[PDB]
Write a protein that binds this ligand. Structure first.
Ligand SMILES: [Mg+2]
Ligand SMILES: [Zn+2]
Lengths: 27, 41, 48, 48, 95, 115, 140
RNA sequence: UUUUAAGAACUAGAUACUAACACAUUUUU
RNA sequence: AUAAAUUUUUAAG
């Protein structure tokens, strides 16, 4: 789900706009 | 398009592919005439 | 700082507009010599 | 050349004012490889 | 590259070599003399080779009277005339 | 009909090497291919002075001009060319030579060089 | 010319007479170019053993461009001829009169890195060796 | 009158034309 | 306790 993270849309950003939760920092 | 068109054509001697050809042929002939001078001595 | 970010971006734009057709390795060479400058100077800060 | 270089002082400000007296930028304006040596190396990156 | 290259390529020539065998093309605006006269062939052909001379007779004949002032030049051109007109004589003689 | 064109329609038979042979025979009879002469657009590196109208070709000027393979061959084997240029004011032909041993040109027949 | 008799074993190759064409008369008129059977000529300077691989022109009846097939087949028979030699009898080096044989021999001889190939620095009269009557008799 | 080119077969291999287009070239030893 | 995926080519100058 798009929670407010990511980009307004991936057009000019040249990336794939692929976002994934960070297993790193949780607790 | 500003500079000399001569640089973009093959026949002119001043550009570096042909000048090198002349260098090589002259160098070879220098080797040959050198060895043939040493033979006669 | 924002300024020198924009200076970098403007420089990349420089490499781009300057070379219409320089072939190839000239472009990669220029971009190398730019980026390496940016990192090597800014090293730590860029992360944040 | 160190014997000569000790008589070179003020190199930094000169480097920074090379902006004004000549067109082409010098992407590394913050070091002279003469006084500061060479502050980085890459070649490992190559193999990697 | 100037069309001098583009008109001489194989893909231009081959259709001419088919038109000779399949019909009455092949110009005569292309080839040169042919040097020897008596070695020419059936009359309907030397007929066209002959005009292929008279035309140049007309061009350079007009090129005679021109005031353009080069007297050495018109001298050599004058000799060229005489040569060609002699050729015309020869093509008529063969006919 | 694109300037960059990948394919060219060929007749349905067209033995290509056969066309190389028959075309190789055809190459002798044509007027243009055999001219022994050549035409090239070029420049004048060393400037000029005309010996007829004393016109000056000032430094480097475009010309439609004529290249010729010279019967000489520099040293044992190097090519050497002779170029001709018509004068703008008068009808006059001036010629070049290209010295491979001495990089600069040397010229003859109808022009002199400025110093 | 001295290094030939040093303890290395080298071979000499002359392919010039592999391809022979002589003029005969047709029954009307012509100049008849015919191919006479050739031979492959290799010798070491020491033993004086003449290796000849005799080549019959019937092999040449199905081809065109016979210069290539010439130099290449001759190179092949140099290769197999080396394959007739055990390690002790393997040549140390190989030398060829022409420098137009260098490439195909470099092609076939790759399997034998101990064998160098060299041009002739001196003009050599192995081309007319067919004038020897015994050799030309064995070939004809 | 004068004149000789044309056909058949064989060989190994790379060279011409164009410049309108782009030309901070920078930079690590 | 994550399942989040942009493109892509022809002519003329
Ligand atoms: Mg335009
Ligand atoms: Zn003039």
């Amino acid at each position: 789900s798009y929670n407010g993270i990511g980009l307004k849309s991936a057009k000019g950003s040249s990336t794939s706009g692929h976002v994934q939760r960070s297993l790193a920092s949780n607790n | 398009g500003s500079g000399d068109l001569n640089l973009l054509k093959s026949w002119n001697p001043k550009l570096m592919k042909n000048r090198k050809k002349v260098w090589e042929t002259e160098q070879d002939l220098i080797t040959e005439q050198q060895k043939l001078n040493t033979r006669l001595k | 700082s924002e300024e020198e970010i924009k200076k970098f971006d403007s420089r990349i734009r420089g490499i781009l507009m300057a070379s219409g057709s320089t072939t190839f390795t000239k472009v990669a060479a220029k971009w190398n010599t730019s980026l390496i400058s940016l990192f090597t100077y800014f090293r730590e800060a860029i992360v944040a | 050349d160190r014997h000569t270089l000790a008589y070179d002082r003020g190199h930094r400000i000169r480097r920074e004012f090379k902006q004004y007296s000549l067109e082409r930028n010098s992407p590394f304006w913050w070091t002279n490889s003469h006084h500061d040596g060479k502050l980085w190396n890459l070649n490992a990156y190559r193999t990697d | 590259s100037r069309n001098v290259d583009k008109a001489n390529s194989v893909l231009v020539r081959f259709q001419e070599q088919q038109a000779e065998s399949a019909g009455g093309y092949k110009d005569y605006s292309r080839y040169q003399r042919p040097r020897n006269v008596s070695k020419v062939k059936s009359i309907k052909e030397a007929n066209e080779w002959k005009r292929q001379v008279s035309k140049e007779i007309k061009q350079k004949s007009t090129r005679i009277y021109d005031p353009s002032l080069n007297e050495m030049q018109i001298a050599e051109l004058n000799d060229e005339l005489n040569n060609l007109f002699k050729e015309w004589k020869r093509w008529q003689w063969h006919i | 009909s694109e300037r960059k064109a990948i394919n060219k329609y060929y007749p349905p038979d067209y033995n290509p090497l056969e066309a190389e042979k028959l075309s190789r025979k055809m190459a002798k009879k044509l007027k243009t291919m055999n001219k022994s002469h050549a035409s090239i657009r070029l420049m004048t590196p060393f400037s000029m002075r005309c010996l007829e109208c004393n016109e000056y070709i000032p430094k480097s000027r475009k010309f439609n001009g004529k290249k010729e393979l010279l019967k000489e061959k520099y040293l044992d084997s190097i090519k050497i060319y002779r170029l001709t240029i018509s004068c703008p004011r008068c009808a006059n032909s001036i010629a070049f030579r290209t010295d491979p041993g001495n990089s600069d040109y040397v010229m003859e027949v109808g022009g002199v060089r400025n110093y | 010319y001295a290094e030939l008799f040093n303890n290395d074993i080298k071979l000499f190759v002359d392919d010039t007479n592999v391809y022979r064409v002589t003029v005969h008369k047709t029954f009307e008129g012509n100049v008849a170019t015919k191919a006479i059977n050739g031979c492959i000529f290799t010798l070491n300077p020491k033993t004086g053993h003449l290796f000849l691989k005799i080549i019959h022109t019937s092999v040449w009846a199905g081809q065109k461009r016979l210069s290539q097939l010439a130099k290449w087949k001759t190179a092949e028979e140099v290769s197999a001829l080396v394959r007739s030699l055990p390690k002790e009898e393997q040549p140390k080096q190989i030398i060829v009169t022409r420098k137009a044989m260098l490439d195909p021999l470099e092609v076939h001889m790759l399997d034998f890195p101990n064998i160098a190939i060299r041009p002739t620095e001196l003009r050599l009269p192995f081309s007319a060796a067919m004038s020897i009557d015994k050799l030309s008799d064995v070939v004809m």
